[PDB]
């Protein structure tokens, strides 16, 4: 019965196996380096294409999805420039201050927190899946003989199949090109973010009371600003991007202290109604760095009997739907080409390989687009600036190629490419 190793129990791992239980594929174990669930306090939103891949795993992660996801009530999301409105009635002012509308109906999002979604598919598990305290430090992989797993608590174990969902700064990736291949560490993509809850009259005196009853978006140079209100409209959620200048000087630490100095200089000289909105935000903050895999694509996702997935293989700003979004199609695929090779070492090695062919070009495609989504929501993306035709025109080609995908299709092309290859 294949052993099949998981390397972390992250929101992709987690699909990984409750994709291949439900097909009773062999014996799978998850391997998490903490000694309980990391506390990461996250939101998402998954597309329809993305719960499409969802159903298709274990319908009972869509189930569990539906029970704590939102949806925004207004298809449409209005793009107001933020920058260069001089009062708040200018601002507020649809026919002046409106760059573009933008109908999300097509990509459907769905918005949850990270924690409460992770932890619904955590007890679809069964107890003997997760291993704590198991933190992959090196494997060796090869000769006609199981991978050797090697953890730093100095244990050992085996698998015939190693599926690494070990995140953005993946171990398993660094292992599987060597620690000075130029994409074995992710990099700093230049946005960070930091998010505030305010009081929703405040969010009131500052946008009107039209602006700050929906979902919303500030665009402006180098920052641009995502806002709304939350459940019952008693409280209202400001997300703040912003161009960083100056190059990440932590290390592959993520979320930095920082104080409200930072959001006041940035939007320094925007208009009245984003300076005051950025006044309520707290002393004390978190700043965010976005890392990704943009500037260094992987030549590929796997070798011999390791295959990467989620933000381990292609690592993806925000700006198109969740990263995960990427990997529910890698755990969709694997489950797919894992079910093949049960109904051999060539054969796991063929499969791994097939999901890397298949995968690699969709997948790193998302990466850059949404990069360059963010550069065009901050207007340093070519020469479009502001222009909200030309944003707008770019919005609606990109997420044709996210929406308009055809799932059955990606995994019959897998399943056949495996079987013409064995
Ligand atoms: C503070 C923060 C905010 C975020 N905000 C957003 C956001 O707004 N939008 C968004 O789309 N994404 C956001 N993300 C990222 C989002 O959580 C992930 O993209 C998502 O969970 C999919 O990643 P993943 O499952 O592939 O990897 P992860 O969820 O990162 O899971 C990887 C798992 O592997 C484990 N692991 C790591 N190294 C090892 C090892 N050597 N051995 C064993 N286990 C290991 C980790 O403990 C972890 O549980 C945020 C992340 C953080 C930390």
Redesign the pocket.
Known sequence: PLSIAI???????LMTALGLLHRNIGKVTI????SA??D?????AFTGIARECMQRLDPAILSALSKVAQRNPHDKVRYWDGFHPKSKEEAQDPEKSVLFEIEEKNMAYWACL?GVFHAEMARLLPERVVRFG????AYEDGGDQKVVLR?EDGEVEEADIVIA????????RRVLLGAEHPAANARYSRKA?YRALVPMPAAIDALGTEKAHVQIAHCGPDAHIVSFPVNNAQIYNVFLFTHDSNEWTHGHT??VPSSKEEILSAVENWGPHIKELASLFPEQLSK?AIFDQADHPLPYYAAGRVAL????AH?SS?FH????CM?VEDALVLAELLEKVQNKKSNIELALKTYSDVRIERSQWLVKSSREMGDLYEWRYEDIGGDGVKCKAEWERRSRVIWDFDVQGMVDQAREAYERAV
Do not use: Q
């Open positions: 390397i972390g129990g992250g929101i992709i791992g391997y998490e380096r903490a669930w990391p990461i306090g996250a939101a998402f990270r198991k933190r992959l430090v953890f969902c070990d995140g953005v700064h993946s171990t398993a973010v993520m979320t965010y997935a989620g933000d381990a690592a925000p739907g969740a990263g995960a990997g």
